[PDB]
Amino acid sequence: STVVTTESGLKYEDLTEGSGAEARAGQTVSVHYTGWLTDGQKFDSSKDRNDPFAFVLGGGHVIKGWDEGVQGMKVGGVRRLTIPPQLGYGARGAGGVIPPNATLVFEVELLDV
Amino acid sequence: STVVTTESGLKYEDLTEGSGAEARAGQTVSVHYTGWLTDGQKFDSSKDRNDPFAFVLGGGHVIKGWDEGVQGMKVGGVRRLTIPPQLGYGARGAGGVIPPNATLVFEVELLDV
Ligand SMILES: C=CC[C@@H]1/C=C(\C)C[C@H](C)C[C@H](OC)[C@H]2O[C@@](O)(C(=O)C(=O)N3CCCC[C@H]3C(=O)O[C@H](/C(C)=C/[C@@H]3CC[C@@H](O)[C@H](OC)C3)[C@H](C)[C@@H](O)CC1=O)[C@H](C)C[C@@H]2OC
Ligand SMILES: C=CC[C@@H]1/C=C(\C)C[C@H](C)C[C@H](OC)[C@H]2O[C@@](O)(C(=O)C(=O)N3CCCC[C@H]3C(=O)O[C@H](/C(C)=C/[C@@H]3CC[C@@H](O)[C@H](OC)C3)[C@H](C)[C@@H](O)CC1=O)[C@H](C)C[C@@H]2OC
Ligand SMILES: [Ca+2]
Ligand SMILES: [Ca+2]
């Protein structure tokens, strides 16, 4: 599998290519995800709550790295995102979970579009 | 299981009670469904398309019987809705699938909220 670095600085890698429908901006998508800090510390997983996460792709209600990075996935796909801080939580971080200026790694599994 | 007839004329019956979170107006819910006419002719199923159906419960983008009927389901539950035409497609029906003045029967499986 290849790694793609976009103009924004996002990096992504398809760990498994999906066989289903393609995710496009505008669609309401459902995913499972896991998030880690660059030291390997897991900070969150939707699988731990057994609760798929739904959002409007390109809707501006998730961090920029997600809105950009989930586009192009196919249902059944697992994509790994490496999100630099300007496309995540930037200088502020996310109180008690994500430090200031953090690069974030997510694995995203696309369940439906 | 019991059958409930609401003030609107909607009838619903919980074929299986869900064990997960309750569906409330406002939530974006994901379901599988099958739809039939009162003579048992199947007109649609999301299972046949392998494509779960997401919608905003109470958002007015589904027939009135759905917006009302899916409220109160729990994740994992299967609810049968009997929808009179005034809470469905009324006198117009829906070209080449649902005739005028059709009572509709749906089975709805709540996948996520
Ligand atoms: C009303 C609020 C509750 C509402 C909560 C949910 C829908 C449940 C949902 C599963 C979130 C998780 O709850 C278990 C939990 O997910 C994290 O652990 C996480 O993995 C993460 O990073 N995710 C979630 C998955 C999408 C990407 C990213 C995100 O974009 O999250 C978004 C986020 C926090 C954006 C901030 C918003 C503030 C800005 O200042 C900042 O701008 C830089 C960016 C989330 C989706 C918000 O849009 C909406 C919410 O917050 C956060 C570390 C903290 C967060 O809990 C709050
Ligand atoms: C932009 C258009 C595409 C867009 C299509 C999708 C998102 C895909 C989605 C799975 C629909 C199915 O696509 C395969 C297919 O589902 C049926 O087979 C069906 O089982 C059905 O009855 N459903 C769908 C499940 C929710 C309840 C109900 C519905 O409320 O459907 C709504 C409906 C048709 C409402 C009419 C709208 C016009 C009014 O005049 C009338 O007012 C009384 C009510 C649907 C969700 C619309 O909001 C949005 C759309 O149409 C219809 C028999 C025909 C319909 O395809 C068209
Ligand atoms: Ca959910
Ligand atoms: Ca879908």
Write down the domain spans for chain A. Answer: 1-113
A67 is catalytic: no
What is d(CA B13, CA A63) in angstroms, rounded to the nearest whole number?
41
Q: Which residues pair with A34 in a beta bridge?
A: A45, A107
Other CB atoms closer than 10 Å to residue A97's CB: what's the count? Answer: 13
Distance A66 CA to ligand 3 centre (A): 17
Annotated binding site of B for Ca(2+): 51-52, 112-113
Atom of ligand 1 at shortest range from CA of A97? 53
**DSSP class of B34:** E
CA angle centred on B71, ends B69 and B72, rounded to 5°: 115
Experimental method: X-ray
Q: In this structure, are residues B30 and B111 in contact, taking their beta carbons and an 8 Å threshold?
A: yes
What is d(CA A34, CA A56) in angstroms, rounded to the nearest whole number?
19
Residue A50 structure tokens? 């057994």
CB pair distance less than 8 Å for B112 and A30 = yes
Distance A61 CA to ligand 1 centre (A): 8
* Beta-sheet pairing, A53-56 with A4-5: unpaired
Measured between CB atoms, which of B50, B51, B112 is closest to A52? B112
User: Quick one: which of B67, B69, B79 has its CA closest to B1?
Assistant: B79
Q: Which residues pair with B66 in a beta bridge?
A: none
Which residues from A are below 8 Å from B when comparing CB atoms?
20-21, 28, 30, 50-52, 54, 111-112
Residue nearest to atom 32 of ligand 1 (CA): A62
Residue A26 structure tokens? 């505008």
**DSSP class of A98:** B
Question: CATH number of B1-113: 3.30.1360.100, 3.10.50.40, 3.40.50.10490, 3.40.50.300?
Answer: 3.10.50.40
What is d(CA B83, CA A93) in angstroms, rounded to the nearest whole number?
49
Reduced to 3 states (helix: H, G, I; strand: E, B; else coil), residue A9 is coil
End-to-end CA distance of chain B: 23
Residue B31 structure tokens? 């379901």
Q: Which residues line ligand 2 (CB under 6 A)?
A: B 33, 35, 43-44, 53, 61-63, 66, 89-90, 94, 97-98
Q: Which residues pair with B14 in a beta bridge?
A: B79
| CA B20 to each of CA A51, A86, B75: distance values in angstroms, whole numbers, following the listed order | 10, 37, 4
B63 is catalytic: yes
Residues after which a C–N gap over 2.5 Å breaks chain B: none
Residue labelled with tokens 């609401």: B6
**Experimental resolution (Å):** 2.0
Q: Which residues of B touch A112 (CB under 8 A)?
A: 30, 51-52, 54
| CA A5 to each of CA A16, A69, B68: distance values in angstroms, whole numbers, following the listed order | 18, 10, 46
